[PDB]
Amino acid sequence: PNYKLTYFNMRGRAEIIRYIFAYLDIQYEDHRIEQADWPEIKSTLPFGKIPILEVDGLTLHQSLAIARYLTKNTDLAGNTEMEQCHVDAIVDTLDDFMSCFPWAEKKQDVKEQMFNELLTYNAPHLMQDLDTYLGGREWLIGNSVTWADFYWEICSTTLLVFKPDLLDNHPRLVTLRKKVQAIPAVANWIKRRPQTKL
Amino acid sequence: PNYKLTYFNMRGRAEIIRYIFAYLDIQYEDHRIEQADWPEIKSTLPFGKIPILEVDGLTLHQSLAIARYLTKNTDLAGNTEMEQCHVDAIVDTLDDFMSCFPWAEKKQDVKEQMFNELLTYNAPHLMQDLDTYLGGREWLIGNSVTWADFYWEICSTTLLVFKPDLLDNHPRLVTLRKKVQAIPAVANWIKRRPQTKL
Ligand SMILES: O=C(NC1CCN(CC(F)(F)F)CC1)c1ccc(-c2cccc(F)c2)nc1
Ligand SMILES: O=C(NC1CCN(CC(F)(F)F)CC1)c1ccc(-c2cccc(F)c2)nc1
Numbered sequence A, B: 001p002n003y004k005l006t007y008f009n010m011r012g013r014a015e016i017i018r019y020i021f022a023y024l025d026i027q028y029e030d031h032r033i034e035q036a037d038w039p040e041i042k043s044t045l046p047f048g049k050i051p052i053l054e055v056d057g058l059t060l061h062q063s064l065a066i067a068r069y070l071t072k073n074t075d076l077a078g079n080t081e082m083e084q085c086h087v088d089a090i091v092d093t094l095d096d097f098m099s100c101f102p103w104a105e106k107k108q109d110v111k112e113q114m115f116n117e118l119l120t121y122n123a124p125h126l127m128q129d130l131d132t133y134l135g136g137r138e139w140l141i142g143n144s145v146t147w148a149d150f151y152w153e154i155c156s157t158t159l160l161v162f163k164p165d166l167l168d169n170h171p172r173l174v175t176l177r178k179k180v181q182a183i184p185a186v187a188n189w190i191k192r193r194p195q196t197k198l
């Protein structure tokens, strides 16, 4: 199909889709919009949010809904139905926490207090639970890489921007980040993608 | 399978699981904990949040991950993979909104004013987008009921608690609520369930 991804010029909520396309070697148009044209383009979107994915004229929304759609019947999905549940659950746990950050907060002092509270109180508990969940296993779920592993690498890359010491006591989680980054198609994407803060 | 659902004594995030069990006529234990039992139970859970579903003693978490698991290969999932994407997307749009409410905010009136702002300034916009998306059709996705319609009905029930006029400009969304509520297995659960505020 002819795939057109629309999002801002940042990794953000589109990046999981971008990793999946890369990993599956699927051609798409990676459309990045100007904040210039955002207020205007906003009115054309189904629920006023991005990313959207256009597939032969049809519009899809919600990044994780799109991610799951693209990974169905692929080796990134989860091998059993129970495994697919665990993939979904880990993804939503990650996404719940990333959504707690007030990314569009205008008041800077309020923003900085909230980011710091989340990073110094809530983040370490989540890192602890993920690490224990992972155990000595090579990937988060099952025998092989799933898109939950991609999403771990994606979310923690952004977290590491604001809290560089986040994983000091979690070498097994650092090892997983490096495993995802070592996948040839992912490594290729990471070297070629636009370099943005977020 | 042996199913044990653990949550608080409220509809809340467990209710979507309870509708699915009701619709599929699945026996389960509806385990409702009190706050006093929570600290001990919490310390035993991999990610420390509820609802959880124990499937033959194996703990699953994340309400929507569990919901999708239970609807896999059923007539609630969406017929095609594209329909499944649309179901997933509408579910996350609804969940995104509900998760914006600071339910466990310690300071009152940062909570009460965030509630009023979300309900007054944001909820109408979402209802409009939902109505537009429904587009005069019978159900949110395709030609038959999906668990997206259940979740619409569940989320709107809770929103109506705080904003009785939520759907006064949207009679087609009221009609959809009533249609879900008239499904016999759902009607039966709604008349029999514990009556709680939330
Ligand atoms: O910076 C962020 N969002 C801004 C908000 C203001 N604007 C929008 C406006 F206001 F211009 F429309 C530009 C975009 C942002 C948001 C989410 C995540 C994210 C989410 C999930 C996983 C994850 F890893 C990262 N990362 C960055
Ligand atoms: O308020 C909430 N939960 C807390 C937990 C402790 N207690 C339970 C106690 F203590 F009362 F048992 C009450 C306060 C609450 C949380 C989520 C949702 C919700 C989320 C998504 C969709 C949706 F429809 C509803 N709704 C209510």
Ligand SMILES: N[C@H](CCC(=O)N[C@@H](CS)C(=O)NCC(=O)O)C(=O)O
Pocket (backbone or CB within 6 Å): A012, A013, A042, A048, A049, A050, A051, A061, A062, A063, A064, B092, B096
């Ligand atoms: N559930 C999220 C929601 C997407 C979302 O809220 N995206 C933000 C950008 S990261 C957005 O479109 N905000 C701009 C606005 O609200 O005007 C998803 O993964 O798709």
Ligand SMILES: N[C@H](CCC(=O)N[C@@H](CS)C(=O)NCC(=O)O)C(=O)O
Pocket (backbone or CB within 6 Å): A092, A096, B012, B013, B042, B048, B049, B050, B051, B061, B062, B063, B064
């Ligand atoms: N993404 C949510 C997360 C669940 C969640 O945060 N649940 C709340 C109750 S509604 C909870 O466990 N609160 C108790 C606590 O955090 O200690 C889901 O649907 O499962």
Ligand SMILES: [Mg+2]
Pocket (backbone or CB within 6 Å): A092, A095, A096, B092, B095, B096
């Ligand atoms: Mg979510």
